[PDB]
Design a protein around this ligand. Structure first.
Ligand SMILES: O=C(Nc1ccc2n[nH]c(-c3ccncc3)c2c1)[C@@H]1CCN(CC(=O)N2CCN(c3ccc(-c4ncccn4)cc3)CC2)C1
Length: 347
């Protein structure tokens, strides 16, 4: 097999001429030439079977992406793995090749308003479809938004996704959380497990702010500092929002803080479009029950030029399968990953 940066990348012979793109905790991603479709593709090598958590993230990624079909969501084109469960060590997932991601793009380019507007529209169009399937992404951020030269945008990474469960969203104050710190809604640190659609809208608001200034809006340095940053810009929560807070410890914490006035969006973003800032305000609303929903955000004046519900498709049915997968040992999850990838086997 070819080898990229030392490591074995055993995808031959359908995929050859490999080239490094990046890496992370998930594994490594390369570009490769597809010999059947005759085109370059992205291929990522996942090696998750030694730990339950890694198996859960792998199964969520595969199960969800195989069931979704939408222009603004990355698909899965092929899956390579051994013919038996005994021999299966690595899983290679083949996806459409894109040019870059929004994280990388914001390091080098300042985006015009019309690029921000079109990218935001596509994020929300893809999110409408995700949410219509009763799925939560739960880790939206610039590096999970893939882009090409024609400005097509595709959402990726469903490793932390879940089926929405508003009835079981409640948790205690300062409860541990896995998704990327800078994009966490304030309620994650106060009373929420991130099991409602509102969690994703907050992250989109953070992405919009980041496209406006090329800097993360709430760069918390650690868990509670994240909430410090959010309250530093939003200011102290209203009495009505405090009375919605659930937890004794969260209420006491917020009541103990000195009063903080809100930092106006037009002072943080003096060159931004006023309609973009009005939508940003509605996405970055403290109380998740008052935060704008995806369909309302699509209908906001900022996106009026693109808004077309007839061209913003929904999923044919909501997902009802387990995405917690909390009670399944890694051996059972390996069996499920094996079964879920069977359709790509030659025979
Ligand atoms: O889908 C993903 N990236 C893609 C996809 C298609 C692309 N086309 N073009 C590009 C591109 C990007 C940038 N510049 C140029 C081109 C693509 C990037 C990312 C990579 C990883 N993926 C998520 C994923 O594969 N899963 C969820 C996480 N999971 C997971 C996480 C951690 C661990 C783990 N393993 C060992 C140690 C620690 N953690 C294991 C499994 C595996 C399944 C999201």
């Amino acid at each position: 097999p070819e080898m990229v940066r030392g490591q074995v990348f055993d995808v031959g012979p359908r995929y050859t001429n490999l080239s490094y793109i990046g890496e992370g905790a998930y594994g490594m991603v390369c570009s490769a030439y597809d010999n059947l479709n005759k085109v370059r593709v992205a291929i990522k090598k996942i090696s998750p079977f030694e730990h339950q958590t890694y198996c859960q993230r792998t199964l969520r990624e595969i199960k969800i992406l195989l069931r979704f079909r939408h222009e603004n969501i990355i698909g899965i084109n092929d899956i390579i793995r051994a013919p038996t469960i005994e021999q299966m060590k690595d899983v290679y997932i083949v996806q459409d090749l894109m040019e870059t991601d929004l994280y990388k793009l914001l390091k080098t380019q300042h985006l015009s308003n019309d690029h921000i507007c079109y990218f935001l529209y596509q994020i929300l169009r893809g999110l409408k479809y995700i949410h219509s399937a009763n799925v939560l992404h739960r880790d939206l951020k610039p590096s999970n938004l893939l882009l090409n030269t024609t400005c097509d945008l595709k959402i990726c990474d469903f490793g932390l996704a879940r089926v929405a469960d508003p009835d079981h969203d409640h948790t205690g104050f300062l409860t541990e959380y896995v998704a990327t710190r800078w994009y966490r809604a304030p309620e994650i640190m106060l009373n929420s497990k991130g099991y409602t659609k509102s969690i994703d809208i907050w992250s989109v608001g953070c992405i919009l702010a980041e496209m406006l200034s090329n800097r993360p809006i709430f760069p918390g340095k650690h868990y509670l500092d994240q909430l410090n940053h959010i309250l530093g810009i939003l200011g102290s929560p209203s009495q009505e929002d405090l009375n919605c807070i659930i937890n004794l410890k969260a209420r006491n914490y917020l009541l103990s803080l000195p009063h903080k006035n809100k930092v106006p969006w037009n002072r943080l973003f003096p060159n931004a479009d006023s309609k973009a800032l009005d939508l940003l305000d509605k996405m970055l609303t403290f109380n998740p029950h008052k935060r704008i929903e995806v369909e309302q955000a699509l209908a906001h004046p900022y996106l009026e030029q693109y808004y077309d519900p007839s061209d913003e498709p929904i999923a044919e049915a909501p997902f009802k399968f387990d995405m917690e997968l909390d009670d399944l040992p890694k051996e059972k999850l390996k069996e499920l990953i094996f079964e879920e990838t069977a359709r790509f086997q030659p025979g």
